[PDB]
């Protein structure tokens, strides 16, 4: 589902600084000697949060390794309340290279071209059923507690010591 | 038998979900000066 999501998002990649300068130069040279609305993967945390609150984002992809985690801790709850399908991606670097940056905390799709409205809708039906139904079971409960063999022996040694006389 | 069949099913589970990919003292490296 990660690879299928990036099959659509790579089709709508924002343009790099080099090919933007070429497009500005090309339209400048034609003037010296009619365009549709650009469709582009939306990025930027304050930008995407505004798109989610205004019910414009059709699909939201959130990174899972934001170093202050508070920046994205509210986003799955915000997407659920607003009704937008969301997915937690693995890697802010992989989202960071989808746009021509180093890292990107969140990435959204608002509108696509007419050729792949069906594939965006299939990906929405894929994410909100192949990802959101499994996490509906376990998102309200606490994580952690992956105690191994050494930690289990150390806890047993602790409770053994508090059996004669708690000091 | 049963344990061997479980390990094959678990390895197929891991591949279908995550793929096939995945002296002693320390000294400061000799970097370019």
């Amino acid at each position: 589902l990660a690879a299928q999501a990036f099959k659509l998002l790579n089709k709508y990649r924002p343009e790099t600084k080099q090919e933007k300068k070429e497009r500005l130069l090309r339209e400048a040279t034609a003037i010296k000697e009619v365009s549709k609305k650009p469709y582009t993967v939306k990025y930027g945390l304050n930008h995407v949060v505004g798109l989610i609150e205004n019910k414009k984002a059709s699909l939201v992809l959130i990174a899972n390794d934001v170093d202050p985690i508070e920046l994205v801790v509210f986003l799955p709850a915000l997407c659920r309340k607003m009704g937008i399908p969301y997915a937690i991606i693995k890697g802010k670097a992989r989202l960071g290279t989808l746009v021509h940056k180093k890292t990107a905390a969140v990435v959204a799709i608002t509108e696509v071209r007419s050729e792949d409205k069906n594939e965006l809708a299939k990906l929405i039906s894929a994410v909100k059923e192949g990802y959101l139904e499994k996490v509906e079971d376990t998102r309200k409960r606490w994580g952690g507690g992956i105690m191994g063999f050494k930690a289990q022996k150390r806890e047993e040694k602790r409770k053994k010591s508090l059996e004669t006389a708690i000091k | 038998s049963k344990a061997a069949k479980g390990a094959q099913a678990k390895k197929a589970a891991q591949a279908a979900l995550k793929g096939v990919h995945s002296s002693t003292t320390f000294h400061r490296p000799k970097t370019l000066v």
Partner: protein, 82 residues
């Protein structure tokens, strides 16, 4: 508008999310030096309302100060000594 959500989250410092994060970061800062440099602010909403920008020339530094007293009371705060 992520920073308005961050402002309300910092109002609830005793909640489960914030007290867990403040616990694991207090241990992390004690493993490091008394004064050290932070690459990014740990509270980006607070730093931005105090005048931080992501420009070349702005840096963030982390600092500990030993709390308590000297029964004499210091007239400046521990933030001033920091």
């Amino acid at each position: 508008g992520a920073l308005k959500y961050l402002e309300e989250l910092s109002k609830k410092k005793q909640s489960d999310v914030v007290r867990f994060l403040l616990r694991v970061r207090c241990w992390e800062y004690r493993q490091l030096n008394v004064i050290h440099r932070a690459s990014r602010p740990s509270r980006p909403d607070k730093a931005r309302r105090l005048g931080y920008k992501a420009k070349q020339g702005y840096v963030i530094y982390r600092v500990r100060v030993r709390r308590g007293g000297r029964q004499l009371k210091y007239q400046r705060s521990l933030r001033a000594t920091a």
